[PDB]
Write a protein that binds this ligand. Sequence first.
Ligand SMILES: O[C@@H]1[C@@H](O)[C@@H](O)OC[C@H]1O
Ligand SMILES: O[C@@H]1[C@@H](O)[C@@H](O)OC[C@H]1O
Ligand code: NI
Lengths: 339, 346
Amino acid sequence: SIKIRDFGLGSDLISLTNKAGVTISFTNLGARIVDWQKDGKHLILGFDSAKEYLEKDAYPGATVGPTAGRIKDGLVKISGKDYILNQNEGPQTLHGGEESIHTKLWTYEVTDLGAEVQVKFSLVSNDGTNGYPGKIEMSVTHSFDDDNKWKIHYEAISDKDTVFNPTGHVYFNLNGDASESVENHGLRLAASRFVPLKDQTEIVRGDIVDIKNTDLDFRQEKQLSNAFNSNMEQVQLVKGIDHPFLLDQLGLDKEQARLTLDDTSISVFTDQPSIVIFTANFGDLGTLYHEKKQVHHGGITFECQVSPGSEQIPELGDISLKAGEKYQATTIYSLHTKL
Amino acid sequence: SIKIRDFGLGSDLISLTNKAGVTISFTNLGARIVDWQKDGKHLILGFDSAKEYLEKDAYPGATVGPTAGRIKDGLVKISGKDYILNQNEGPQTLHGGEESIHTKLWTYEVTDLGAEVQVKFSLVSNDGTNGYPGKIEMSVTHSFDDDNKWKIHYEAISDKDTVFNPTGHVYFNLNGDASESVENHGLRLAASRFVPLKDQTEIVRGDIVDIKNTDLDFRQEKQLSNAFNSNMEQVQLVKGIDHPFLLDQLGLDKEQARLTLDDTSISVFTDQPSIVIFTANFGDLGTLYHEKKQVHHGGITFECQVSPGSEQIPELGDISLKAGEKYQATTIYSLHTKLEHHHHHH
Ligand SMILES: O[C@@H]1[C@@H](O)[C@@H](O)OC[C@H]1O
Ligand SMILES: O[C@@H]1[C@@H](O)[C@@H](O)OC[C@H]1O
Ligand code: NI
């Protein structure tokens, strides 16, 4: 079934319940996921109204872009030309600059396919917005099916050569409560390398590092507490994880990562080359989620995209989008319950 | 009473009814008015859903900007610097450029003051959008009260020196049917001069002309057909009216214009220096409004703002907005019944 309701500030809340009684909900404010629940328990972090997101934290669950991550000095080169983007974190451009696409009300259309329901969000980024060449016509289709598969499909077309590499910022917390650390979840990640950060500014350091056999090797399922208790300088730098991981094998068919807690597990599939993991290293912030004060490590992201830092490390990939080319991306979050 | 419902594509429809039973409706898509009715009759032009606006014509009843009108070559000078803006009409920048503010979903909050209800819509124009320096935090408050006054209050603050001069693009049609021309309406307008257009491109000629005692002189009420039937060069150029008129006396207190049909009148008040008037010179386009094929001259706007062309005619004003300065503008459309005797035929 489908239910639409006023989410505040002129935004809508779109809730989908599949045949298995699983409920997932989204909002047009930032083409974002707000909740995902099973048997009354929330699997992800989210607020109860549009206002909360604009006052507390606008990233959770949102479509971020046009470029996800930090861009050193807000500098990108396009067709040999240097372009300066909006700088919203010191000199860096973080998640597309200030008042980016996650803060806008997107238009949308719901398509009921029976076993599957689709919500297609659209937004036009004008040419010059936050320094990005355009216009860029973008759409993010969030879908949910009777197999408990939540899929995200991106599409974009630009009138001019530009850059584009968005992502989904959902934070998972199988504890169903923000006051509870995810240190108890087990994680499996099919990546043998990672991208270290230069320092507290969080820009990339410049190199690619092999993590095989270190506290960050999750090639074999392990509890996050390990990583959390690690003394690797990289973990110590950010007090948790806040880094890009390079997937070993590319393709939408492989389970790239898996987050597990008890009988409940979430598998991640993507056509993207990397997964950026952030473990809500907020310390004492205490953001309130559903009346619960969030704890340091009270959530984990799986941002699928091209790794940030390509500006300095070309081997990472190329985020350019040529005029007239159609950009496409697909990321899947699959829910599973042990019998 | 206040009522809300989905209006299409994710937008909302905000419907207000005052103590006199007069209803008015707005949409967050473009901080726009959709309808205004008296006793079941549409006073303005509008559609029945958001999609229609996007597919037929996105201007009607919309908030337009950041700069309303045409800027020759998209060129503006800002604090000694030349800036080129998005060019969406040949080399011209028309109504802020492509996919501008009128096409966005603005966030909004309603405030019930009893005798007055305010609908404040908000939107941020990011720095560099369509070429405009910013970022610009804008808000448009549409309010309707027990005295049948529909007021539009604009507010804006920029992080950077930029340009700002928006307007409201409502179209009136007292016939309550798009298929009927407004030539049967009577118009009073307190303006002695106008701004001629260079040509078909519609950029300003460069001069300001006195129109006293011509077919465009409406200081004393006259039927609109007098203008429509005119063969003055400017009228023939655009097949109707499509020009800025300079107010003679400035101030929000003065009734600058009055549109009448039988027992109904719309009065226009504003704190702006001009009124840009467009009489839907669409010819045979026939856009459908509530299943009625719109006719040539099937509507009329009263776009209060600083006159377009200031780039070429500095006398018109200055639309610059200094960083940190708070911009404000207020326009009021008031409904009256039996204000005067208007009984004519065509
Ligand atoms: O990596 C980012 C982190 O450092 C913080 O800024 O929140 C958003 C994350 O995606
Ligand atoms: O003046 C404008 C007219 O010439 C046309 O472009 O439609 C919109 C009006 O605002
Ligand atoms: Ni709504």
